[PDB]
Amino acid sequence: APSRNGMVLKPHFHKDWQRRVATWFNQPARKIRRRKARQAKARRIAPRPASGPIRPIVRCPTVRYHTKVRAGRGFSLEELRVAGIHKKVARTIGISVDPRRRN
Amino acid sequence: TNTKGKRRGTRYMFSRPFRKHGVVPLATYMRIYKKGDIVDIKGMGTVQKGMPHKCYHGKTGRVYNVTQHAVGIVVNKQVKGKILAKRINVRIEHIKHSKSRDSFLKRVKENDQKKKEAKEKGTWVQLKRQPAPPREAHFVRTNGKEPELLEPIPYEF
Amino acid sequence: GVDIRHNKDRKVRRKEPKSQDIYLRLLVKLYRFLARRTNSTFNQVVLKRLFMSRTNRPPLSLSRMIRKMKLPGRENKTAVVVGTITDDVRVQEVPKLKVCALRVTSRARSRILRAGGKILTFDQLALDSPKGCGTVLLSGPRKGREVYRHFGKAPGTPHSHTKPYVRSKGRKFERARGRRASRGYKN
Amino acid sequence: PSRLRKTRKLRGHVSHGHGRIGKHRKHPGGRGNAGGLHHHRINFDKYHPGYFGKVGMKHYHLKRNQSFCPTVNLDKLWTLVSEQTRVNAAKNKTGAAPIIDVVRSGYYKVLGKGKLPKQPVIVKAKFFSRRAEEKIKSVGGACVLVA
RNA sequence: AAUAGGGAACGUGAGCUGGGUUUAGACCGUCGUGAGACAGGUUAGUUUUACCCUACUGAUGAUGUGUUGUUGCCAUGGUA
RNA sequence: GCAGAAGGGCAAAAGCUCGCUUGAUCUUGAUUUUCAGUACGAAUACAGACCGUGAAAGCGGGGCCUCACGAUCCUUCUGA
RNA sequence: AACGAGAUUCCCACUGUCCCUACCUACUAUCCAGCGAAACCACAGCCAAGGGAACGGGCUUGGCGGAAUCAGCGGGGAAAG
RNA sequence: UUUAAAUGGGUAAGAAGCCCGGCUCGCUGGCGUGGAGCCGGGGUGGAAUGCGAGUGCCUAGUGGGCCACUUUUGGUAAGCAGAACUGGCGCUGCGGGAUGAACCGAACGCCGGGUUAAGGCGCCCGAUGCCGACGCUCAUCAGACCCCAGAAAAGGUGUU
RNA sequence: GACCUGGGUAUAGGGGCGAAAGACUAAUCGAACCAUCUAGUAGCUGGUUCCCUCCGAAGUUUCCCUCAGGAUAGCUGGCG
RNA sequence: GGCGACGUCGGCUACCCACCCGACCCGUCUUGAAACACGGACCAAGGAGUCUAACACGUGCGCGAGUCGGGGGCUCGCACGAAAGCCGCCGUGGCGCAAUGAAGGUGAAGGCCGGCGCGCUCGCCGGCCGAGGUGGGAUCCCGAGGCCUCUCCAGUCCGCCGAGGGGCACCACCGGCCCGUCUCGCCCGCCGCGCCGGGGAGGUGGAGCACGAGCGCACGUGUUAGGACCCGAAAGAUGGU
Ligand SMILES: O=C(c1ccc(-n2nnc3cccnc32)cc1)N(c1ncccc1Cl)[C@@H]1CCCNC1
Ligand SMILES: [Mg+2]
Ligand SMILES: [Mg+2]
Ligand SMILES: [Mg+2]
Ligand SMILES: [Mg+2]
Ligand SMILES: [Mg+2]
């Protein structure tokens, strides 16, 4: 059953897998569902911006990626203090606030 | 089954045949082998230290290495499905020169000086050797006497 | 009856190309008209390289070309290569060599034409030279693939150099007995 | 495509391409990699020497971010920049040398390889091999380390 | 008078009989720690179908001779 | 006679006595033997080290040679 | 001792167990009237010798062969289950 | 076991050679030594006969074999068990052996002509329906074509 | 008479029950039946559906708790 | 050149019959089948090498030191649209371009000239280049010489060209280089003189280098895992009547 020169194989099929299969025959039908969940949410609220609030500037935390810069989670909580805006008007101004963040 | 051993079918072929026992004659050591000298293998039985294998008692090879007491020889041992150029380290006693290349080396050397001898003589000498030709029409003589009649003898026990 | 052969009487080479490429079929019909009428060989070598498969027409790099044309005797000849010319970046300076090939890439044919070369295909070669006189015919490294380094004696016996198939080159993958004498044996 | 394959071609031949004698049954030699030690030994070896046993030290929870050093050797070093500069930084005036930093291209280490051309270079990388920097300090170039 | 030796799927079970062998019950002896074993022994133990073709034994017959009947001959085959 | 089973080998010897002695030591490869031309084992020539012997050339990395032995995992001990 | 649809041997009386079979009756079988299955089935069915997968029905060489059948019959079909 | 056959096995029958001339070397070392190495220069017809050869890839099927001369081992011996060389059936018809896996010929597209092979030529059955040639043999169980399907010791004034 | 018999009730699968035979437990018992896991595994038998054209073998080596099988080489084809 | 109708002339099909010769019944295991080896009464329809993943190799296509949008996003509220089109400061990411080592780690260029420090086998310097050499190697180039109605005057040519040159792919070899260990050895460097780094020359281990050839997609073949070509048990387990 092993024959001339080839690859040793470990396929993970000894476990019964014909019950836990997940066909994606609806992955178009979810994209046309979650554009309506945006288009009837982009006009639903306001001339407030879509694509969420203003997100911070964040540097990636590993030796692999610390040369590039990522959008993060929220202003740490002294940027609200240095720029001089109260911490619980900041999320209804439309700025995203991350409470537990260090600087 | 049949005891896959070294030195097995060699009651007769690793022994001095007769009246030739004792120490080896010392001309066997005063031989000069170079990288390329074609040699054959005939293993002696007094010098236990390098004798090749019973596959090689009588197979003619060619030197590729010379050492302080042995000679590396490459030979052709027939295996089942093919042959193999195999290389063997044989001691100096277990071989000897091969006289199978004398009657090429002399007949090229009387085809060099015999080529240029006919070159300044002006001919087409045909130095290439030919196989044994059929008997050209000879001519016999029955000088005086006449052929002796013979006939089969009668049966006796 | 006749003999006891095991048959090689059917030759096995290519005679018509297995690609349904209608443009290569307009270059077979050009050259096998010129192969049997040239009374020479350069067509009959080009005519069988248009038959060959995708593997046996390897991608000739640019820098193999401009090295084999710097020999004494190739100074203004027009290099012909059956196969694709891809540019290298390891060389810096490209002369104004003139080539003639199927499918030079987009970046290579910039770098040939900007330095003042000329590229061709095999239809403005015939008009220039039906004999194909004054050319060097090139081919890439057909044994350059990673397939050919799997091929050798067997990846187990002495002096292997055969790169045995593993699913990941790393530790505890084919490195325990068969590779070192402290565990098991060494090949 | 069921036309082109073999089970149309072999439809009518009784044993269907698996012998009258072995008569291919279900699993004659054990399922999968069965018997790599015993009866498929000659096939598990010669074709996979090294397959059986420990070889190294454990490193529990290795993180694939700290062995991260993508490597340029110098023959790919001029093609990180626009070629409009390496002709421009080769104008005979002075040592007008441009920076070429690999760490804004995705590389951390400059390995050695021969045949660098004759322009003066300064290279920002985190790691240099000692063959590589003497391939830069021989073209009148410098080697500025940074991280 | 003689109590000759033999063969025919060790002739012969849809001919029979079951006495022994050779299932399951049981007893004894010897062997085995034991379950049990024993060409050692004993007792108790379901024997299926022919209506198919052939062979055969009988029974009407059949062709050919114009229909039909009476009296006959005998090729052969059996054998005291 | 050569320790032992046979076969081969051996005479200022491979035997028998004598005198020293640790080469039965460290080390990397190549090759031979059964072979699929894998592995263990055994064996062969070498090479680098340290030595022994001999006055010396030399010989000596176990037994005169053909058999005397054993993977992964695990345990143990040693080595920079 | 008694007892036993227990096992074995002998004796008396008895008898178709037998020597050695014969006859008679009833219900079938048999035939007609009516109703009417299954078992099984490559093709089918005469024999001797030969060879053959060593014991055929079919091949070889011989012997030979008449329609369609009924009542039986248990040699064969290495019958059928 | 002194000797030692036949058959068999190895090698060789040229340019990949041969010769001359010169430089490296840590090897060897009385010695421009020895030996390898390299560079340049000189001359192609070197036994027969036949033929196009080389090299890489992937991999199905198979892993129950038997028979024949010849040489052999067990066995009293076998259509027996085990071998060696080569052929053959298996996978393969056809002609012949009456019939048959394997013998003797001979190998196959479909056909018309001609000829032979092994074999046969009383009639089944194509062909001696030849003025075939020479001798032997009579059985009250004649004999009658390799494998092959029935025989010996011994004996005869049966006959040459 | 340690007798036979109707209905009610109790005991349920490694469990019931047995004056003991591995009997009986819904024709099923040296472990009942019904459903699912499950289309359970099978080195083992049975089968495996169109035509032409080309090539066309193997029963041996080595190893295996191997001897009805597989691996490896051998032999084959296709591709170049 | 000849012969001839209202019933004749040719011609056969899945037609019947008669004759001669040939001919044992088919699937199957098997060294061996007609078997006294098994299955097969007949006929219709159903009825058995699939799909998914992974790999390997061959071929085909596109791009090519790179390739790939498979996942999201964009376009109006379109049937065929669950399609197609585009994104690129959507390339994150896969696989490849870089191997070796247990691991810390380290990580692939020599050549030619000249000048030199005892040119001392060690070594130092600038210059030109630049993938090393040997032997084969299709092809291409030079090619002495020849070849046309008369001999001397010249042109593009052609064909046969002896010899010679450059040499693709590849095959064998020699050298080099990178990494792991081992023997021998001397030198240098200073974010600071140390049980510090760096190097050398030999010999081996490596799935390496020596001007890269891969990715994507489709198809075939083969192997494995999945009920895995279809059919088949004695069992085993849970949960119940
Ligand atoms: O009835 C039968 C009977 C007889 C034969 C079969 N067979 N045999 N093979 C057969 C194939 C198909 C059909 N039936 C078949 C079946 C049953 N009995 C019987 N006889 C003897 C032994 C066994 C039994 Cl059961 C009884 C028992 C008591 C006496 N009265 C009769
Ligand atoms: Mg197949
Ligand atoms: Mg099979
Ligand atoms: Mg009468
Ligand atoms: Mg049959
Ligand atoms: Mg249960």
3-state secondary structure A52-102: CCECCEEECCCCCCCCCEEECCCECCCHHHHCCCCCCCHHHHCECECCCCC
Conformation bin of residue C167: beta by default, left when phi > 0, alpha when psi is -120 to 50: alpha
Helix (H) or strand (E) holding B90: strand B83-91
Q: Reduce the DSSP state of residue C2 to 3 states and report it.
A: coil
Residue C14 in tokens: 């290519």
Q: Let me know: does D132 contact D117? Beta carbons within 8 Å.
A: no
Q: What is the resolution of this structure in A?
A: 3.9
Substitution target from D44, D51, D72, D139 for chain C, most C beta carbons within 10 A? D51
- Which residue, among C91, C108, C94, C97, has the nearest Cα to C138 in the 3D structure? C97
Q: Let me know: does D116 contact D135? Beta carbons within 8 Å.
A: yes
The C-alpha atoms of residue B69 and residue B46 are separated, in whole angstroms, by 16
The C-alpha atoms of residue B147 and residue A29 are separated, in whole angstroms, by 122
Q: D46, C89: Cβ pair inside 8 Å?
A: no
DSSP label of D90? G
* Strand H interface, protein residues by Cβ within 7 Å: A 3-6; B 17-18, 34-35, 38, 40, 58-61, 76, 78, 98, 100-101, 104, 108, 111-112, 115, 124, 127-131; C 1, 150-152; D 17-24
> Is C175's Cβ below 8 Å from some Cβ in D?
yes
Sign of the alpha-carbon torsion through C144, C150, C151, C152:
positive
Provide the CA D2 distance to its chain's centre, in angstroms. Answer: 38
Using alpha carbons only, give the angle D111, D114, D119 rounded to the nearest 5 degrees.
95
Residue A66 in tokens: 């610390």
User: What Å value separates CA B125 and C1' G71?
Assistant: 115
Calculate the alpha carbon distances from C45 to B127, C74, C83 in Å: 43, 19, 13
Q: Let me know: does D121 contact D141? Beta carbons within 8 Å.
A: yes
Calculate the alpha carbon distances from C26 to C40, C79, C123, D65 in Å: 21, 22, 10, 54
Q: At what angle do helices C42-49 and C25-35 cross, to 10 degrees?
A: 150
The CA R_g of chain C, rounded to the nearest whole Å, is 23
Q: Is the CB of D14 under 7 A from strand J?
A: yes
Q: What experiment produced this structure?
A: cryo-EM
D71-73, strands of its sheet edge to edge: D71-73, D109-111, D127-128
How remote is the CA of residue D13 from the centroid of ligand 2, in Å?
12
- Count other C-beta atoms under 10 Å from residue B88's C-beta: 20
- Which residue, among C74, C177, C77, C86, has the nearest Cα to C133 in the 3D structure? C77
Q: Tell me which chains share at least 3 CB pairs under 8 Å with chain D.
A: A, C
Q: Let me know: does D128 contact D143? Beta carbons within 8 Å.
A: yes
Residue type, C11: K
Q: Let me know: does C132 contact C73? Beta carbons within 8 Å.
A: no
> Is D60's Cβ below 8 Å from some Cβ in C?
no
Nearest CA in chain D to C90: D75
Q: Let me know: does D81 contact D99? Beta carbons within 8 Å.
A: no
C135-138, strands of its sheet edge to edge: C99-101, C78-81, C135-138
> Which residues surround the ion ligand 3 when the cut-off is CB under 5 Å?
D 18-19, 22-24
The minimal CB distance from C156 to the residues D46, D52, D54 is found for D46
B38-41, strands of its sheet edge to edge: B83-91, B70-78, B60-66, B38-41, B95-97
DSSP label of C162? -
C148-152 contacts: CB < 8 A, separation 24 or more?
A: C150/A5
Residue type, D94: T
Nearest CA in chain D to C175: D50
Beta-strand (E) ranges in C82-119?
Answer: 85-86, 99-101
DSSP bridge partners of C79: C99, C136
Q: Let me know: does B70 contact B89? Beta carbons within 8 Å.
A: yes
Q: Let me know: does C105 contact C85? Beta carbons within 8 Å.
A: yes
Q: Let me know: does B91 contact B49? Beta carbons within 8 Å.
A: yes
Q: Let me know: does C108 contact C130? Beta carbons within 8 Å.
A: no
Residue C39 in tokens: 């009374």
Sign of the alpha-carbon torsion through B46, B49, B55, B57:
negative
Distance from CA of D93 to the nearest CA of A (A): 35
Q: Reduce the DSSP state of residue A19 to 3 states and report it.
A: coil
Calculate the alpha carbon distances from D131 to B64, D74, D92, D134 in Å: 41, 11, 28, 6
| Residue D32 φ then ψ, to 5° | 80, -130
The C-alpha atoms of residue C66 and residue C81 are separated, in whole angstroms, by 12
The C-alpha atoms of residue B16 and residue B98 are separated, in whole angstroms, by 20
Q: A64, D65: Cβ pair inside 8 Å?
A: yes
Q: Let me know: does D98 contact D77? Beta carbons within 8 Å.
A: no
The C-alpha atoms of residue B88 and residue B73 are separated, in whole angstroms, by 5
Q: Let me know: does D53 contact C177? Beta carbons within 8 Å.
A: yes
The C-alpha atoms of residue A39 and residue D47 are separated, in whole angstroms, by 59
The C-alpha atoms of residue D19 and residue B14 are separated, in whole angstroms, by 51
Residue A17 in tokens: 């897998």
> Is D118's Cβ below 8 Å from some Cβ in C?
no
> Is D50's Cβ below 8 Å from some Cβ in C?
yes
Q: Let me know: does C111 contact C53? Beta carbons within 8 Å.
A: no
The C-alpha atoms of residue D48 and residue C176 are separated, in whole angstroms, by 10
Calculate the alpha carbon distances from C29 to C32, C122, D66, D77 in Å: 6, 12, 59, 46
CB within 8 A of C92, min separation 6: which ones? D78, D117
Nucleic acid strand I: bases within 7 A of protein CB: 38, 41-45, 47-51, 54-59, 62-66, 69-80
Q: Let me know: does C79 contact C118? Beta carbons within 8 Å.
A: no
Q: Let me know: does D77 contact D101? Beta carbons within 8 Å.
A: no
Q: What residues of chain C lie within 8 A of the CB of A6, using their CB?
A: 165
CB burial string C135-168: b at 16+ within 10 A, e below: beebebeeeeeeeeeeeeeebbeeebebebeeee
